[PDB]
Symmetry: D2
Subunit: 519 residues, 4 copies
């Protein structure tokens, strides 16, 4: 039985491809999908972070929805300590990226009239007036409810729906006022204090970057974060504002736009054009749109991201049950596998690593499933279709990337080696989805850290000084890649690899491709 689902790889049709999937066809060692871990109480100690790295974590995510600057600064310090605890061995060292996830725009209710812990009950068909009057800020009850969104009246019409407490309660706008809305309770429940509010189908005019977000983005520039996950992006202008706040000092920080509501989906193309990558933020997205539609948006977005060559992250509740249990449900294994088959560059753990009981098991399981689904991709068709989608472009590096990936298919190369400094050459190789891993050797540490955003890039930091003879400097980096690959078990002596390098020191991309045996 061939490894890596290669029998299924040879199928003519997608049906026969599916039919040939073999549970006894062992995957390869290398795992191409990036794993993004939300760091929290369960995972922010240095020792646990070392174990997260060993288990497969590639990006550490700090959710600034909560936590002080001091707290997240400590977390980032602990991440970097754990990461550098491995730095003595350049051949085993794994770059770990650092991501800042902004709090973004939020709509919150007031305090329920009473002592605290108090609740009111909303019965279907009842009347509830929403009021912006700060006089009712702490006197919410069954008849009057205050929320912090001063402009809500301008963005809602009669009959539009208002969700409260993460969609648990739904309201329909019956009458509209200047500083109030009169609504009928469509779906009822018990309402507590300071709950989340969502406005499905509305063009929310809250600022793209709030005052807290500006402070947090400047903090992230100060802490040398590799990338920002920007919340509730509804339009390209929101990305532009985030970019302006990051400004010239943070020009190289990768901006990942989070798609979280209907407008972000409807305007997704302009957002994608303006972004460096995308996160499918399925939790809030499933509150804003019918949950049964989320997969449509997920697949659309991953497809379009794959088309543009831009990183896409699938996030939220992928292994939810592992917050409390050491093993995932069958639905969760299926969700991770199908996100990989969809084409997600990275998959994410939220509560599973922030606060749950089994963060390391969660990371390890995402790693195992990811390797299995990577082999099960139908690469020949995927490659043909990606090439068809990008055919209006005649970019020279895409030509080399496509030629190199084709060569890697034809001779079943064990890896592609890419010498890169901005990372773009490796990015363009990853875009055309080879099955073999991409060992990207770079002297730019931030390039290495950001590379985790691209499917299949295993970044290696070259710390050697520049060799005077360009050819010998190239051979140095290629041999670094050979040794890393041998140590990680991706290939051995006598295997075949594709090597992408620059012809001369002034070559602006890897314009040179070779089939080389491993020494």
């Amino acid at each position: 039985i061939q490894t890596q689902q290669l029998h299924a790889a040879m199928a003519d049709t997608f049906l026969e491809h599916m039919c040939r999937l073999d549970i006894d066809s062992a995957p390869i060692t290398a795992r191409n999908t990036g794993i993004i871990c939300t760091i929290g109480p369960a995972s922010r100690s240095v020792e646990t972070l070392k174990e997260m790295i060993k288990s497969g974590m590639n990006v550490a995510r700090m959710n600034f929805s909560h936590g002080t600057h001091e707290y997240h600064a400590e977390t980032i310090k602990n991440v970097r300590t754990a990461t550098e605890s491995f730095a003595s061995d350049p051949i085993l060292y794994r770059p770990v990226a650092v991501a800042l996830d902004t709090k973004g725009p939020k709509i919150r209710t007031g305090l329920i009239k009473g002592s605290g812990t108090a609740e009111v009950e909303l019965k279907k068909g009842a009347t509830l007036k929403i009021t912006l009057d700060n006089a009712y800020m702490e006197k919410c009850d069954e008849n009057i409810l205050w929320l912090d969104y001063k402009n809500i009246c301008k963005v809602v019409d009669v009959g539009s729906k208002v969700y409260v407490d993460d969609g648990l309660i739904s309201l329909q706008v019956k009458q509209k006022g200047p500083d109030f809305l009169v609504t009928e309770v469509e779906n009822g429940g018990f309402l507590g204090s300071k709950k989340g509010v969502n406005l499905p189908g509305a063009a929310v005019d809250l600022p793209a970057v709030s005052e807290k977000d500006i402070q947090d983005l400047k903090f992230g520039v100060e802490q040398d974060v590799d990338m920002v996950f920007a919340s509730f992006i509804r339009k390209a202008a929101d990305v532009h504002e985030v970019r302006k706040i990051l400004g010239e000092k943070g020009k190289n920080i990768k901006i990942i736009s989070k798609i979280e509501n209907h407008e972000g989906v409807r305007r997704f193309d302009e957002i994608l054009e303006a972004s460096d990558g995308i996160m499918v933020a399925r939790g809030d997205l499933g509150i804003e749109i019918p949950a049964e539609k989320v997969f449509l948006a997920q697949k659309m977005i991953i497809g379009r991201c794959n088309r543009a060559g831009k990183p896409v992250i699938c996030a939220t509740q992928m292994l939810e049950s592992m917050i409390k249990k050491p093993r995932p449900t069958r639905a969760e294994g299926s969700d991770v596998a199908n996100a990989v088959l969809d084409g997600a560059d990275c998959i994410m753990l939220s509560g599973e690593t922030a606060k749950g009981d089994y963060p390391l098991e969660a990371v390890r399981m995402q790693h195992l499933i990811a390797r299995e689904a990577e082999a099960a991709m139908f690469h020949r068709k995927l490659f043909e279709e990606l090439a068809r989608s990008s055919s209006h472009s005649t970019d020279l590096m895409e030509a080399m990337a496509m030629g190199s990936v084709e060569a890697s298919y034809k001779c079943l190369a064990a890896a592609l080696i890419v010498l890169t400094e901005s990372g773009r050459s490796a990015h363009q190789v990853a875009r055309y989805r080879p099955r073999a891993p991409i060992i990207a050797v770079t002297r730019n540490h931030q390039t290495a850290r950001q590379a985790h955003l691209y499917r299949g890039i295993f970044p290696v930091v070259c710390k050697d000084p520049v060799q005077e003879a360009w050819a010998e400097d190239v051979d140095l980096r290629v041999n670094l890649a050979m040794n890393v690959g041998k140590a990680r078990g991706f290939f051995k002596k006598g295997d075949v690899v594709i090597v992408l390098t620059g012809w001369r020191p002034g070559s602006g991309f890897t314009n040179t491709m070779r089939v080389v045996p491993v020494p």
Copy 2:
């Protein structure tokens, strides 16, 4: 905005098809994937079952792992009471099938020494003797463990793994003895009394049908069940053995083989050939094989069943969290949607409807997700690949089915109407996956109930007597389907349907196809 993802339907490639999935494209009313609900304490009252039927239940599953014959007979009687409560209106009556799911062969440990309610701790790296000596049957502990599987020594080698308590505990056979096993605790835990044992990769020679199973199968025959879900099917002989047990009285009862371990997967083709259908029983399957591999087996199995035209069920933990919560996780919505896209004819609920707090919510969510994913199928490609896969067959009924489905694609027919008595004509239409629903009108009540196993067959019982004039009998049955379709909102006057009928009373299949406007 085109409905039913028809814009994505027109794409040239799978990538572009995915890129065109649009959350604002509304699905049709008809829902094709069958929903199989496990009935238990949370759902067996007559009134709740009426709600189950209205919310979308097509098959009632009785899990005979537990429950007395009296309990399940009462449950089945309540299912039939609820079902017949709609029978006064033939146009609104919905056939509801009744399925018996056998307990099957099981390996169980002994009682923990003392009360029996005690537990002992199995420490990783510790040693554990498995024993067949009935003296330790009730004196199980941390050092010695008794199993009721007398032949285990015959089917296990040194280095084999033994899982205990639903995979929570893992043992590796270090030394093999005459009536015992010396094992190392690879994965530890607290071992209670009388827990399940699994033997990954082992050819378990327990009987296909246990002593309990024979009694339960005869009980199901007396109860006039439409179908049996036969547990732990490992090979064709097991399906035959079950078929023999069902005998002459149960010759028309459909046998659905549950693939639950490695051997059933490895020997899947012969099992498929011998069965009427297949269940991807992901729970036990994920205990027997690495959970990260279950999706492979799922897609392979669904593909192969789709290839053969035989019903396939996806089962277990699809909406697991809904046992305790009123809405599913995003991983669960993804799981259901991808099961439908895989091509599963039916999706299943177990604890979610048997015992959970939100059974009706689970049914409703499966129904909504199924409709959205059905629209998102890539019908043109699926049809081409199914046809290519079956191209060595020149069967006349397949020819009629493919022509009818092709015509239904071309003119966007609102439905296909198929007059059938054995069901085979409707089965062959459903096999070639039209997007429009299949209204199968039959005088055979059992055919109507069993048709629920096939994607898209909406079965309708004709209770009228046979008309002397064949043409008038045909028109009677066709108008019944038209009236059901209008009442269910599947089409209205002026829409177009495909109608498949027999030319004369002696036609052995629907050899006549028409494109008809809805009156």
Copy 3:
């Protein structure tokens, strides 16, 4: 042993493997789907020669009005009709033959000259089945020909001849206006660089296939056979590749009009057509035609696609189509089954014009309309059974697709059946 009709190649996954599987020992079927159009002139206008030309496979007779008086072509047409009707006693074996008038056209010139107007009116008076309109340059020329044919010739199919650069560049509007197209390669090869003709040919056939409108490939197909009894290798190749391109009909000009070997030329076109028809890649072609027409949801198109699909699946020996305007049969032929289409009609002009469509074998039912709709439908369906058995298309126990109207007022064949041959 060896599958017939290039069916082994039919099962191929790629076009390359389809080529690699072409087997000179895989026998074609008896039926020949590509229409044969013969220019009649001195070598072929006698009643006896025309009888043998029908028997050899001529389906359409073309009168080239570049030269000749009305009296001369009138007599040619009379002899055509005499030879044709000599077979009319046997309705099972009678073969309808269409009569086509090819206008002289421009020889800054107007689309339709004064001579051309008189000739077109003559064609109306002569009851021609179709007009081949020379040097069509734009849709307006087609509209002129249509107005000149007027109400009396409103049923005369207008086949525009694409003969220069402008006609190619403006081909889409011409095709929209036309009932069909001829790739008139003689003049086209002079008006545009000869080495580009194949591009034009392949483009035009493709677009006509996309539309379901008849396309004729014409001129010098078997040129050397004017003076020689056997074709050159390039000429056999040219006929075969014109069939593979998708031509509904292939044409003979001097080869039958004035050459020494008219019958041999017709027979050679018949043989090559039959072999090339089997060598088509039907699965991909059907998929690509369906893809191209998917914005249409027409009901008869759906019936045609479903019936062609069913005929592929069960390898039906034929599709039997009951039709009066021909449209039902035209829609079936458009989706290119490999099996012959036996179109039974009571409209004689319909039967004659059906030759413009690949695979339509027209059969004129002469019995009177039966009182019961079901019995009249069986009458025409059994007419087709008897024709197919007599012509060697099928025998008892074979499977045929049968397309009929359900009830008397059906506006198309809305009923499809898979039927055993009696």
Copy 4:
């Protein structure tokens, strides 16, 4: 506003839409990939006419030993070589010309026309005594290839191979398929042969004429599948023996033979004895260029890759990667440094639309490369530089200057360059996207 070289049709999703987009106003490129093979005879064997034949595009000269003495054909070959070398002073513009020997094979003669017996068990030998003498004469004359008439089985090919023996071991054997048995036993014949000719003259008599195209498309397909050269021959422009312009069926035939995938097309009487040999060569050159652009390269590449997917050969990987890159960036050429020819052959099998400039120091490699679609061979006569990189750069720049001189590309255009990394590299393991200097 109108793409060249049928690039709009190149973007189609289906074969049908690819046909519908074929555009007579889309200009083809200057380079012509299909090799042109000319039979030399009384109408064309003079040194001056042969110069004009080279300039019109003749790539291979064919000596038909059905008639003529050794001395006569020796003189024809001598004149070919004189005409060819008259251009050798300029290595940038020198065009290698291959010499081919076409054996007489079995014949039946009666005034003394040939006789054909379809379906007869002709007892004639595979290789006659005259055939043996002519093959040895070809070895003595340093012919680049042999067209072996009437091969019926692999054993016939093996006989010709043995007769050529060790002294002629590099002479390419092109089996001529011209009767039913050769078609039926084609797979073993292809395996044993270096290439194939579809000898449609004899084939159209030995099998029913209406079946010839079936054989032609089958054979070209299988030869394309194997990467072995296939020639389409006989009566492609027959009417041009006596007329200055071809018939429509003849233009169609040449164009469809290129579309089928034939590496070469041939002229026999049209150049051997006809009144318009130069015109026949020029007509094939023009039609080839138009049909070459009209190929459906994307589907063709997918299907060739699919049929060869069981191979993981490294040079195949380089060729497929280089051709894929040449499609993506619309490169004007692929430059291939080769000595045996194998690397360039492997590129040619995967059918780029851009021309393949094969730079070699092996003169016979250069002459034989004309059997492969798109290989424009260039003879490097410079001495070997001491530094490998400098020698590679020297040959690559020779190719640059050739492409600039021939109008294939200009400064600032993009080319794919296939070279060996080190002198002992056994194939072109190095690919670059390079700007033209």
